[PDB]
Design an enzyme around this catalytic site. Structure first.
Site: not given
Ligand SMILES: CCCCCCCCCCCCCCCCCC(=O)OCC(COC(=O)CCCCCCCCCCCCCCCCC)OC(=O)CCCCCCCCCCCCCCCCC
Ligand code: HEA
Ligand code: HEA
Ligand SMILES: CCCCC/C=C/C/C=C/C/C=C/C/C=C/CCCC(=O)O[C@H](COC(=O)CCCCCCCCCCCCCCCCC)COP(=O)(O)OCCN
Ligand SMILES: CCCCC/C=C/C/C=C/C/C=C/C/C=C\CCCC(=O)O[C@H](COC(=O)CCCCCCCCCCCCCCCCC)COP(=O)(O)OCCN
Ligand SMILES: CCCCC/C=C\C/C=C/C/C=C\C/C=C\CCCC(=O)O[C@H](COC(=O)CCCCCCCCCCCCCCCCC)COP(=O)(O)OCCN
Ligand SMILES: CCCCCC/C=C/CCCCCCCCCC(=O)O[C@H](COC(=O)CCCCCCCCCCCCCCC)COP(=O)(O)OC[C@@H](O)CO
Ligand SMILES: CCCCCC/C=C\CCCCCCCCCC(=O)O[C@H](COC(=O)CCCCCCCCCCCCCCC)COP(=O)(O)OC[C@@H](O)CO
Ligand SMILES: CCCCCC/C=C\CCCCCCCCCC(=O)O[C@H](COC(=O)CCCCCCCCCCCCCCC)COP(=O)(O)OC[C@@H](O)CO
Ligand SMILES: CCCCCCCCCCO[C@@H]1O[C@H](CO)[C@@H](O[C@H]2O[C@H](CO)[C@@H](O)[C@H](O)[C@H]2O)[C@H](O)[C@H]1O
Ligand SMILES: CCCCCCCCCCO[C@@H]1O[C@H](CO)[C@@H](O[C@H]2O[C@H](CO)[C@@H](O)[C@H](O)[C@H]2O)[C@H](O)[C@H]1O
Ligand SMILES: C[C@H](CCC(=O)O)[C@H]1CC[C@H]2[C@@H]3[C@H](O)C[C@@H]4C[C@H](O)CC[C@]4(C)[C@H]3C[C@H](O)[C@]12C
Ligand SMILES: C[C@H](CCC(=O)O)[C@H]1CC[C@H]2[C@@H]3[C@H](O)C[C@@H]4C[C@H](O)CC[C@]4(C)[C@H]3C[C@H](O)[C@]12C
Ligand code: CUA
Ligand SMILES: [Cu+2]
Ligand SMILES: [Mg+2]
Ligand code: NA
Ligand SMILES: [O-]
Ligand SMILES: [Zn+2]
Lengths: 46, 79, 98, 227, 58, 514, 259, 43, 84
Positions: F61, F126, F157, F240, F242, F255, F290-291, F316, F438
């Protein structure tokens, strides 16, 4: 040269909206069905 | 001579979440102290504190593997 | 200590590279490598916009440092004006095939 | 444990988890406030026929909406970090217990005094007892003394697992070759549940964690009886 | 050796509407046909092999 | 002719078109997988009766939505279509290399579906953490096929990133500084920089997972002195960047869409928006751990990453407030695209704020590897990347096709999707605070209300996906040819008509320096 | 008829043959590792090399022979190659991270020391130092070759470039030798892992770079390069400096500090 | 935006067919598989 | 640093050839001497079957699946020791 303009800059024909409907149906349909047939395939393996 | 041992106390050499080295150090220290004594005649007893800390902290399966390897000649650490 | 045997752009450059090179020797810019210098862009002194056809897209940076570019087609004929600032531009057709 | 239609955090079992709830209420007021202000202002911008389509000056207002957001982050970080360092602060545990993760069950080791160790497996649904909880019950609970600082050492003998007890605010990954420390202090007796919180294969959903918190004397007699 | 670049510039600039990968002449064509054949044959042998590996064979 | 044009392309619009087609097909695969997921969780118990199959569905997925739907549509699709037109460039710098970026993706995908057809598939997540992803816990070809799929998508990419960076730097009119390029072009160049720097670190990690599995290396294996946490660091060092890669082109399109349907010549705070997207790109490289707040790392490290993660809120925030500022005093056209964009601003904000909750290592201890993370990231991919893709697609379909959509059908599609995604993901917050893990195929009984509501919502979004297909068919079936587009003076990509010809800017634009 | 300086490229099959060659090599490695067969690999490797040849050949045709390489096209290729090299630095950085991670915190399985118990490392003063001397020399020799070309000097360019390649090949034969002679293997835990994978990728890049130089040597033989237009040569020179500097980092880190 | 009226208009009847056919292409095959799940397990 | 030589007026091929034959190749020739001197074989060490070495999690996809790719019988033991 290549054809330009509406319905001509794409790799699929839009000449006939029913031939097109068949194609769109096969194409989005093969995509959506694929996972169901993989689950099937693994369930049957064992 | 603290004895009256409940568990391994805070060692300031190993202050963070990873306690792998702490177990490992106390395992080496014990078998070192044990070799000093079981050579120069004396009493394993003085090694006791190292024994209680490593026994408290080390997974059974680590000690068990470390012991099997001391016996085999394949123990990678220096004793 | 030294010697030759290595060709020059003048001897061996060809096709569009040769065309760009020879044009620059004469101080001409047929392949749009340089930013045009603006005129005062009045009715009397319009911005002269070379084209190989009877229309070409202008983009007007109305004021220095503006981040917004105003885009419009310039047609052969009467001087048009930038829809934001009013500076005039005139198409000066035809060229290339030399 | 969680109860049906639960919205927020499991009730606090330790004073650490008591602190996370009050920090969460804090952070969530701030989330609701900002979320509401954004929603409101969008609708304000979208509900007038009045127009101003010419170039707007950006200097003065960009100040307001970097300084304000920066202050809000500090209002959050301050107590976030107070709690982080409070958690870390030195405790002096009375007791050390190891847990090894496995495919697919938890093994426990109490080896301060005697060589006490057992395996802890999920009660199969077909073998539940009246009023027992599907996917949460274990054959052998982790009995621990209430009202006392315990050190948990966590690890694995196969793949990553992670040892969690949401009520106590605990989650420590279980990694082979590594011994992760955490400290545990139930203010209350009872049963406190958790689940393997790192994907470990076929049965990741089915290797749970039950803590049984009882007084020391019951803990001592339990331990003796488990040798 | 002598500098035969001018010869090659004539050959590759000849107004015959051939794309650059074919403009060298008949060997360009042969090499392309061998390349595309190996690619398309290899890809079908690839699809066969996924076929093979998708079902159990003790 | 069909082969020379569609298999041998060197045209930026035709390749953009192959990308959008590929993305749309991947989207269907991605969607089916997401429904198998939510079918399994839809009532208590086991549906597939095999929680490796469930794990394989979840893994694929994510691979499909991330690598085969979002990136190819946003960068491959909208990127190749719009970037050359928006700088009056006659194509991309390396127009043949551009075609290989595209044809690497079908092979990459064939490798993923092979992974799921051989042995028992890759039930790894993943993230593909070892030792579960290793040659003991995942013996056989599945994980290696997954690694090789990621290798090809990776090369695609990296070469694409070199192509967009070169194209945007080198192929502007001589008078256009980078401070005269539109914000979508900025979003793609900054995205391309992230791709250039991050993917080669993933390639390293997964190549070291390939050698541990097949050449008896021990990078991640304690027995040989290795460390599974090493792989986590390499993966998240990419992972991150990513996620910012997944949203920056989104920001770009938001925008343009908000500016256009506000009937404004420009977005508010152009330079601020450039600053924000560059700050976000930079900060996105110094927050990856932070992951990893639960792997057992030192308190000071956990305080740095908590703090560095929160900073990102500021830049942001300047983008969000600047979009409200663009709307302010707009002559608002309530087009389908504007609806997607207003949906985006709200749902992205919600998702980003739950991110700020997760930034606090303290709370993340309780929330990590729960459905609160799943809720956070579905609010910013399935109401962020997806909502920006829809808004862009309905807005630029006329440019790409020459044909117009039925605006009523498209507002209907927006309305169905909005309810779907909100019904699917809002409740998952509750499932998360209350401690539902999860990568679970079944849950303790208390979790049933929200899992039932969530699974029901997953079906309302299926209905939108099906309607979407019909809507695109109706547009092509009816053949309403475009005449007039407003605001071409600040939207150069429309100025060559709809569709634009195969060859555009054969004569470059004219731009004075003054 | 364009009035911009940029290159519209003829329809090419090479992107497709490239992508399929990628599928054939990856599915061939899978076939090799798992189903004990090499034929898919053999075919993918072949088509890959066939692709590579015809693609870069076409670039020569497009540039030397058709003159599509205006200063603008050349400025683009510069950026392209700089961006490609940056991507390769980040790839290597992954392995340095691996190396520094494993060696800075040696685990109990290793004896809690670096080097690990039972690892007898190569003397950084023996072939390692020679290898360093060879790559640095090649760095000097390729710079002489560069200045020769810019000054019109055909014979001295070919001489400097031959030397640069010889040294390239010398490094390669030396490394093959010390691979054979090394008492440790890729399977000697994380020491063997970091050592052979980091230097092995380096070794590949030395071969790629050497191959590139050889292409430049033969193009120079056929007089493709002018004293002012020779981007194939600069790109190869940039790649070659990259390979050189990666080696200095491997030497300082794995061979010296890691010994 | 502005546009020419449709070159080949698609009536309500025609939309009903295209929508019906579109939905069925998604639902039949998935439905077939989900319906036969038991048949896949017991095997 | 200036290194310690001198030079640096104009920048010719001539200078870089000077350095190629004056410094570079001489350094290579010294290091080649210094290497074809400390070579010849060395006391192969007592085999100890340490568990952090001779790793086998999967057979190698060549040979008998137990030899590394650049196996040297002289200096590389198998997990069961050196070869006859
Ligand atoms: C989906 C089903 C909803 C279930 C509600 C359960 C009520 C029954 C128990 C009736 C009440 C029983 C009393 C029990 C008290 C327990 C207190 C507690 O444990 O405390 C913890 C509670 C506290 O939370 C709450 O206090 C409930 C959250 C409600 C938020 C506002 C939404 C209200 C509209 C409801 C529709 C939702 C769907 C669309 C929401 C849209 C996306 C946000 O749980 C949380 O922490 C939730 C965390 C959510 C984080 C997301 C932040 C973004 C918010 C954006 C708002 C947009 C404005 C709406 C604008 C709406 C326009 C569309
Ligand atoms: C972009 C990324 C993306 C997208 C779009 C989605 C979309 C959805 N996801 Fe996804 N999900 C992930 C990325 C994404 N997800 C990741 C990374 C994970 C974690 C994996 C792991 O744990 O290892 C995950 C995990 C995950 C889980 C948890 C599994 C578990 O922990 O056990 C669930 C459960 O509800 C879920 C549900 C859904 C649903 C219902 C949708 C959607 O159905 C919601 C509706 C949206 C759509 C249907 C979008 C359709 C768009 C198109 C078709 C494009 C059309 C093309 C053109 C117009 C050109 N997801
Ligand atoms: C497009 C994708 C995307 C984006 C943009 C983001 C944006 C952010 N993410 Fe998220 N994230 C994911 C995709 C994304 N994320 C995925 C896929 C995962 C997990 C994947 C996995 O495990 O498989 C994840 C996981 C993840 C975790 C780990 C949770 C765990 O596993 O335990 C954390 C922790 O800090 C986090 C934080 C954030 C933060 C702080 C932002 C910030 O960038 C958000 C900033 C935005 C705002 C804050 C809102 C707008 C601002 C304002 C309105 C101004 C005012 C605001 C304040 C004053 C705060 N994310
Ligand atoms: C761990 C240890 C701790 C120690 C602490 C470390 C500290 C590190 C400090 C770093 C210092 C950084 C400062 C940044 C700026 C430096 C100077 C700026 C240079 C510059 O920008 O100057 C320009 C360029 O010069 C140029 O590159 C330079 C041109 C040089 C020419 C003059 C040199 C002549 C001297 C002898 C040369 C050396 C011999 C060569 C052969 C050697 C063979 C072995 C101007 O050129 P110019 O003068 O017209 O002539 C050019 C010569 N053709
Ligand atoms: C098993 C290992 C084998 C190793 C394999 C790899 C080796 C790499 C080498 C490649 C082979 C190439 C060599 C080229 C040799 C000769 C080229 C012929 C031309 C020539 O003879 O060159 C001359 C100078 O070079 C000359 O003496 C050439 C000088 C040669 C230098 C060799 C070094 C000798 C070392 C002895 C002294 C050491 C002392 C150094 C200490 C001080 C250093 C600080 C100058 O020419 P010219 O007058 O300008 O020409 C006129 C018009 N062109
Ligand atoms: C001087 C160097 C010459 C190189 C040419 C020779 C051989 C082919 C391999 C070259 C490719 C380089 C790196 C790939 C990874 C590992 C190889 C490491 C280098 C090497 O060759 O190391 C050898 C291991 O060989 C082994 O297993 C390796 C067996 C071969 C495995 C095939 C490669 C499979 C992995 C491919 C992954 C590619 C992913 C790239 C991603 C692209 C970016 C997106 C060392 O021999 P040993 O007997 O252990 O010790 C010596 C003891 N006397
Ligand atoms: C046993 C042997 C095995 C060998 C197989 C392994 C692989 C080998 C790859 C070797 C690399 C060969 C590259 C050849 C490039 C030739 C084409 C060329 O060099 O083209 C030049 C431009 O460069 C351009 O496109 C730029 C060219 C860019 C190419 C970059 C090459 C490096 C990357 C290779 C792949 C890396 C793989 C990494 C794996 C992890 C042409 O312009 P000029 O030179 O200015 O000429 C024009 C003048 O003549 C006008 O007067
Ligand atoms: C485990 C196994 C995995 C295997 C995966 C392998 C993937 C793909 C198969 C390889 C096929 C490559 C075939 C040759 C490609 C040459 C590309 C090239 O040379 O690209 C150039 C552009 O990039 C430039 O310069 C500079 C860029 C040059 C790129 C070289 C391509 C090599 C790709 C290797 C991987 C890159 C990433 C590495 C980092 C991890 C030329 O651009 P074009 O648009 O062609 O022409 C434009 C005209 O103006 C020229 O006259
Ligand atoms: C460039 C300057 C940036 C400034 C920021 C700092 C970044 C990097 C340099 C820092 C590296 C050394 C840090 C010294 C501090 C401690 C080192 C240490 O020891 O770190 C170890 C691993 O570091 C390791 O390999 C770490 C390996 C390096 C990882 C760094 C990641 C960044 C890489 C990307 C940068 C781009 C590169 C561009 C190319 C030039 C962690 O293991 P411990 O936690 O000790 O476990 C022992 C326990 O018993 C303790 O409880
Ligand atoms: C998208 C691409 C995905 C690729 C998936 C990766 C799988 C590649 C595996 C290649 O498969 C090969 O097929 C052979 C036949 O063609 C097999 O013959 C094997 O099968 C039979 C054994 O019963 C006999 O034919 C032989 O003895 C025996 O070698 C052989 O082992 C196997 O390697
Ligand atoms: C998550 C995506 C899925 C969403 C839900 C899709 C549900 C839509 C239903 C379409 O499915 C059909 O349902 C039929 C039954 O209603 C099945 O016939 C089955 O049952 C009939 C009688 O009950 C028999 O006539 C048939 O032989 C037998 O195949 C048939 O195969 C299936 O296509
Ligand atoms: C100076 C620079 C560019 C201005 C121009 O060339 O047009 C502008 C663009 C964005 C600006 C920044 C953004 O507005 C975000 C911040 C806003 C605060 O009011 C000041 C600092 C702040 C960090 C600004 C500093 C400076 O004014 C920036 C960096
Ligand atoms: C053939 C050519 C002379 C005629 C011309 O310039 O074309 C000369 C110039 C430089 C020569 C080369 C260089 O001297 C470098 C090499 C020197 C070796 O001694 C022989 C091979 C070697 C590779 C030479 C072959 C050949 O004699 C070359 C290539
Ligand atoms: Cu053990 Cu999940
Ligand atoms: Cu992140
Ligand atoms: Mg986790
Ligand atoms: Na279930
Ligand atoms: O994130
Ligand atoms: Zn103007």
């Amino acid at each position: 040269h290549y054809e330009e303009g509406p319905g001509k800059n794409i790799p699929f024909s839009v000449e006939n909206k029913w031939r097109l409907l068949a194609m769109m149906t096969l194409f989005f349909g093969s995509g959506f069905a694929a996972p169901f047939f993989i689950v099937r395939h693994q369930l049957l393996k064992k | 001579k603290i004895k009256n041992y409940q568990t391994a106390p805070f060692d300031s050499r190993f202050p963070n979440q990873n306690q792998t080295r702490n177990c490992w150090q106390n395992y080496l220290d014990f078998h070192r102290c044990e070799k000093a004594m079981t050579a120069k005649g004396g009493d394993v007893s003085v090694c006791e504190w190292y024994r209680r800390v490593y026994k408290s902290l080390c997974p059974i399966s680590w000690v068990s593997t470390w012991d099997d390897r001391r016996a085999e000649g394949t123990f990678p650490g220096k004793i | 200590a030294s010697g030759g045997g290595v060709p020059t752009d003048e001897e061996q450059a060809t096709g569009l590279e040769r065309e760009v090179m020879l044009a620059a020797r004469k101080g001409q810019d047929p392949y749009n490598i340089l930013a045009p210098k603006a005129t005062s862009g009045t009715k009397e002194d319009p911005n002269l916009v070379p084209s190989i056809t009877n229309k070409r897209i202008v983009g007007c940076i109305c004021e220095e440092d503006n981040s917004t570019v105003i885009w419009f087609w310039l047609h052969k004929g009467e001087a048009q004006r930038c829809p934001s600032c009013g500076t005039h531009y005139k198409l000066v057709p035809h060229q290339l095939a030399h | 444990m969680a109860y049906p239609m639960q919205l927020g955090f499991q009730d606090a079992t330790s004073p650490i988890m008591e602190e996370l709830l009050h920090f969460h209420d804090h952070t969530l007021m701030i989330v609701f406030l900002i979320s509401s202000l954004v929603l409101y202002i969008i609708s304000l911008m979208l509900t007038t026929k009045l127009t101003h389509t010419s170039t707007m000056d950006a200097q003065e207002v960009e100040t307001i909406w970097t300084i304000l957001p920066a202050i809000i982050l500090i209002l959050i970080a301050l107590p976030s970090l107070r709690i982080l360092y409070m958690m870390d602060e030195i405790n002096n545990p009375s007791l050390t217990v190891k847990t090894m993760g496995h495919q697919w069950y938890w093994s426990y080791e109490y080896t301060d005094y005697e060589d006490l160790s057992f395996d802890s497996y999920m009660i199969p649904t077909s073998e539940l007892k009246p009023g027992e909880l599907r996917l949460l019950e274990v054959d052998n609970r982790v009995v621990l003394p209430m009202e006392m600082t315990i050190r948990m050492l966590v690890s694995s003998e196969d793949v990553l697992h992670s040892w969690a007890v949401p009520s106590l605010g605990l989650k420590t990954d279980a990694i082979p070759g590594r011994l992760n420390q955490t400290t545990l202090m139930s203010s209350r007796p009872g049963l406190y549940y958790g689940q393997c919180s790192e994907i470990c294969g076929s049965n990741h959903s089915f290797m749970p964690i039950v803590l049984e918190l009882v007084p020391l004397k019951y803990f001592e007699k339990w331990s003796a009886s488990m040798l | 050796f002598e500098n035969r670049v001018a010869e090659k510039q004539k050959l590759f600039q000849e107004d015959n509407g051939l794309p650059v990968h074919l403009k060298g002449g008949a060997t360009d064509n042969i090499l392309y046909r061998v390349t595309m054949t190996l690619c398309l044959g290899g890809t079908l042998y690839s699809l066969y092999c996924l076929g093979w590996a998708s079902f159990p064979h003790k | 002719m069909f082969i020379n044009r569609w298999l041998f392309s060197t045209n930026h619009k035709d390749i953009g078109t192959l990308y959008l087609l590929f993305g749309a097909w991947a989207g269907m695969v991605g969607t089916a997988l997401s429904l198998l997921i939510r079918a399994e969780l839809g009532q208590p118990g086991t549906l597939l009766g095999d929680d490796q199959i469930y794990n394989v569905v979840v893994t694929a997925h994510a691979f499909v939505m991330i690598f085969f739907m979002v990136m190819p549509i946003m960068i491959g699709g909208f990127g190749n279509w719009l970037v050359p037109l928006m700088i009056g460039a006659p194509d991309m710098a390396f127009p043949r290399m551009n075609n290989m970026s595209f044809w690497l993706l079908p092979p990459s995908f064939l490798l993923l579906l092979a992974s799921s057809m051989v042995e028992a598939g890759a039930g790894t997540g993943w993230t593909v953490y070892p030792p579960l992803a290793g040659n003991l816990a995942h013996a056989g070809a599945s994980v290696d096929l997954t690694i090789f799929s990621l290798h090809l998508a990776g090369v695609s990419s990296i070469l694409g990133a070199i192509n967009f960076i070169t194209t945007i730097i080198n192929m502007k009119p001589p008078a256009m500084s980078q401070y005269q390029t539109p914000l979508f072009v900025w979003s793609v160049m900054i995205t391309a920089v992230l791709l250039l720097l991050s993917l080669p670190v993933l390639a390293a990690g997964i190549t070291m997972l390939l050698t541990d599995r097949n050449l008896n290396t021990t990078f991640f294996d304690p027995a040989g002195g290795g460390d599974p946490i090493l792989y986590q660091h390499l993966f998240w060092f990419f992972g991150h960047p990513e996620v910012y890669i997944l949203i920056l082109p989104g920001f770009g399109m938001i925008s343009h869409i908000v500016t256009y349907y506000s009937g404004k010549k420009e977005p508010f705070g152009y330079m601020g928006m450039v600053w924000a997207m560059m700050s976000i790109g930079f900060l996105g490289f110094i927050v990856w751990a932070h992951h990893m707040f639960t792997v057992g790392m030192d308190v000071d490290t956990r305080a740095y990453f908590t703090s560095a993660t929160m900073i990102i809120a500021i830049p942001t925030g300047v983008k969000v407030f600047s979009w409200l500022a663009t709307l302010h005093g707009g002559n608002i056209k309530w087009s389908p695209a504007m609806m997607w964009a207003l949906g985006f601003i709200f749902l992205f904000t919600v998702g980003g704020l739950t991110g700020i909750v997760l930034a606090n290592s303290s709370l993340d201890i309780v929330l990590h590897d729960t459905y609160y993370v799943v809720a956070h990231f579905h609010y910013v991919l399935s109401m962020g990347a997806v909502f920006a893709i829809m808004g862009g697609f309905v807005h630029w379909f006329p440019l790409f096709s020459g044909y117009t959509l039925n605006d009523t059908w498209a507002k209907i599609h927006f309305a169905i999707m909005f309810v779907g995604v909100n019904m699917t993901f809002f409740p998952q917050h509750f499932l998360g605070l209350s401690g539902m893990p999860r990568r679970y195929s079944d849950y303790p009984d208390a979790y049933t209300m929200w899992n039932t509501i969530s699974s029901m919502g997953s079906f309302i979004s299926l209905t939108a996906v099906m309607l979407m297909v019909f809507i695109i068919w109706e547009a092509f079936a009816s053949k309403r040819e475009v005449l007039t587009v407003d605001l071409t003076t600040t939207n150069l990509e429309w100025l060559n008509g709809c569709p634009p010809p195969y060859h555009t800017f054969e004569e470059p634009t004219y731009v004075n320096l003054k | 008829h364009q009035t911009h300086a940029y290159h519209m490229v003829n329809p090419s099959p090479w992107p497709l043959t490239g992508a399929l060659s990628a599928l054939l090599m990856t599915s061939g490695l899978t076939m090799w590792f798992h189903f004990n067969s090499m034929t898919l690999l053999m075919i993918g490797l072949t088509t890959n090399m066939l692709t590579m040849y015809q693609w870069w050949r076409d670039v020569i045709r497009e540039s030397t022979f058709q003159g599509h390489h205006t200063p603008a096209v050349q400025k683009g290729l510069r950026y392209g190659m700089i961006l490609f090299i940056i991507s390769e630095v980040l790839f290597f950085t992954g392995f340095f991270w691996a190396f520094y991670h494993s060696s800075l915190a040696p685990t109990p399985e290793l004896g809690g020391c670096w080097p690990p118990t039972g690892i007898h490392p190569l003397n950084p003063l023996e072939v390692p130092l020679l290898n360093t001397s060879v790559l640095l020399a090649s760095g000097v020799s390729i710079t002489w070759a560069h200045h020769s070309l810019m000054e019109g000097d055909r014979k001295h360019m070919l001489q400097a470039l031959f030397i640069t390649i010889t040294l390239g090949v010398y490094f390669t034969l030396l490394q093959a030798s010390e691979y054979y002679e090394a008492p440790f293997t890729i399977s000697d835990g994380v020491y063997g892992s970091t050592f052979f994978v980091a230097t092995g990728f380096h070794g590949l890049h030395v071969i790629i770079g050497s191959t590139f130089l050889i292409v430049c040597f033969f193009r120079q033989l056929k007089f493709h390069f002018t004293s002012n237009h020779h981007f194939g040569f600069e790109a190869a020179a940039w790649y070659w400096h990259f390979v050189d500097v990666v080696w200095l980092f491997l030497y300082v880190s794995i061979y010296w500090w890691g010994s | 935006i502005t546009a020419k009226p449709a070159k080949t208009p698609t009536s309500p009847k025609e939309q009903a067919i295209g929508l019906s056919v579109t939905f069925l292409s998604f639902l039949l095959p998935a439905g077939w598989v989900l319906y036969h799940l038991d048949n896949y397990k017991k095997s | 640093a200036s290194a310690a030589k001198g030079d640096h007026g104009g920048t010719g091929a001539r200078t870089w050839r000077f350095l190629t034959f004056g410094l570079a190749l001489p350094s290579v020739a010294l290091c080649t001497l210094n290497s074809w001197l400390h070579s010849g074989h060395r006391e192969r060490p007592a085999f100890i079957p340490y568990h952090h070495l001779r790793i086998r999690t999967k057979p190698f996809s060549w040979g008998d699946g137990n030899h590394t790719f650049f196996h040297n019988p002289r200096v590389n033991p198998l997990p069961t020791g050196y070869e006859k």
